[PDB]
Amino acid sequence: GSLIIGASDDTADTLLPFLLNRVATLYPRLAIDVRVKRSPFIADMLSSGEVDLAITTAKVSHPHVILRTSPTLWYCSVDYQFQPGEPVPLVVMDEPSLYREMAIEHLTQAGVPWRIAYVASSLSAIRAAVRAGLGVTARPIEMMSPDLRVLGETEGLPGLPETRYVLCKDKQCDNELALAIFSALQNSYQ
Amino acid sequence: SLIIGASDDTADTLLPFLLNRVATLYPLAIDVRVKRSPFIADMLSSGEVDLAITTAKVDSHPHVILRTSPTLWYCSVDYQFQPGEPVPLVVMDEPSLYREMAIEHLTQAGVPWRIAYVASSLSAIRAAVRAGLGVTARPIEMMSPDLRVLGETEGLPGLPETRYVLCKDKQCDNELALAI
Fold first, then answer.
1. Whether residue A126 is found in the same domain as residue A159
2. Hey, of A25, A78, A147, which one would you mutate to test binding to chain B, going by the most B CBs within 10 A of its CB?
3. Which end of chain B is more exposed for a tag (fewer CB within 10 A), N or C?
């Protein structure tokens, strides 16, 4: 058998290697192809069979196994001059972006004003901007560095929902190997 | 010109990053003096350091808050939590603010625990956890790719936040006031 795993950049460096170690344990002789692409594209690839399995952070209409639940936090640089009396300058990816929408829903919900301080098209560009003090972002605990500060209730920012890293197969999947991996991971977390 | 005292937890994570910024303010050459957090305030009292940073509460020095970090239960990526059993704790040798913190909150919540590994440093805490001996409690700045966070859904109680504070004494020092 063969297996192609879909993943977006928010998992490629974090939960993807975890999944690959789990898969290797169950199938040491399985060679794995990986596609990394923005979450809108990978959702479509799973639907079309371009990938057999996908690891994402979206609210996923589908069969899914939860690989991990992590806090989501507000981050700024080690020496960022955060100012309560002003609107949160956001470093976010371009539309569409779950973390951008999450940040914005929660500031709105909580009544806290905000602006789009900086747009970039990748997690790597996001990380760099925050680290280099261009503003604030909302991301999973996996993004953390000793390089970064967390902002919260003391600084006036609201709680954020947890990030769920989820494994997805298509409703009509018939790759028997993707079906056993799904089922094997499922029998771990329940 | 200047001497600072720092709690090990500050030294072992955020501090060199924090000073690297202050390394743009050209050389003064800063000198870092480390002890566990309950001992830092005494280093200002005796005149030994001019400024200090600790995660201890300061009883009586003027201090400002540098950041408020969440404090979290961490285990390895692969570690299997047994919700049945006493929590196997991975802790530093006494005295240790985070060991005390861990044991206080577990006991208060009626959650049984046990010392699975007594360690001698932060690196040693990490290596123990990475080897799957158990769980440790530490601030967010401990996060790494070899770890994951446990909590509510695992039955584990929330921990209070960690405030890293910067202290000065009531003293006349021109270089100290600039770092404020």
1. yes
2. A78
3. C
